[PDB]
Design a protein around this ligand. Sequence first.
Ligand SMILES: *[C@@H]1O[C@H](CO)[C@@H](O)[C@H](O)[C@H]1NC(C)=O
Lengths: 49, 33
Amino acid sequence: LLHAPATVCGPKKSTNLVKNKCVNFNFNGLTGTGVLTESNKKFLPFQQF
Amino acid sequence: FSALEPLVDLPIGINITRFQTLLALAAAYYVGY
Ligand SMILES: *[C@@H]1O[C@H](CO)[C@@H](O)[C@H](O)[C@H]1NC(C)=O
């Protein structure tokens, strides 16, 4: 520990994806609450949120 | 004007203080801080 910042981490589990309902969400470390819908916004191939 | 996009995020913990450069033995390269 405390040397060579974390590079060997345990597996991360996933669940199903729901839309149009109030659901708690955690998108790769981003915690929030709301309703998720498809959008026409276009990001750049390296932008996450 | 042209912006720079990321490529790599190597998680290696070495410390860097001085660097160098290769030449394939018309060359010109600029260095800023
Ligand atoms: C900087 O390099 C020294 C070795 O010269 C090392 O002990 C130290 O941990 C390094 N610090 C960082 C932040 O990389």
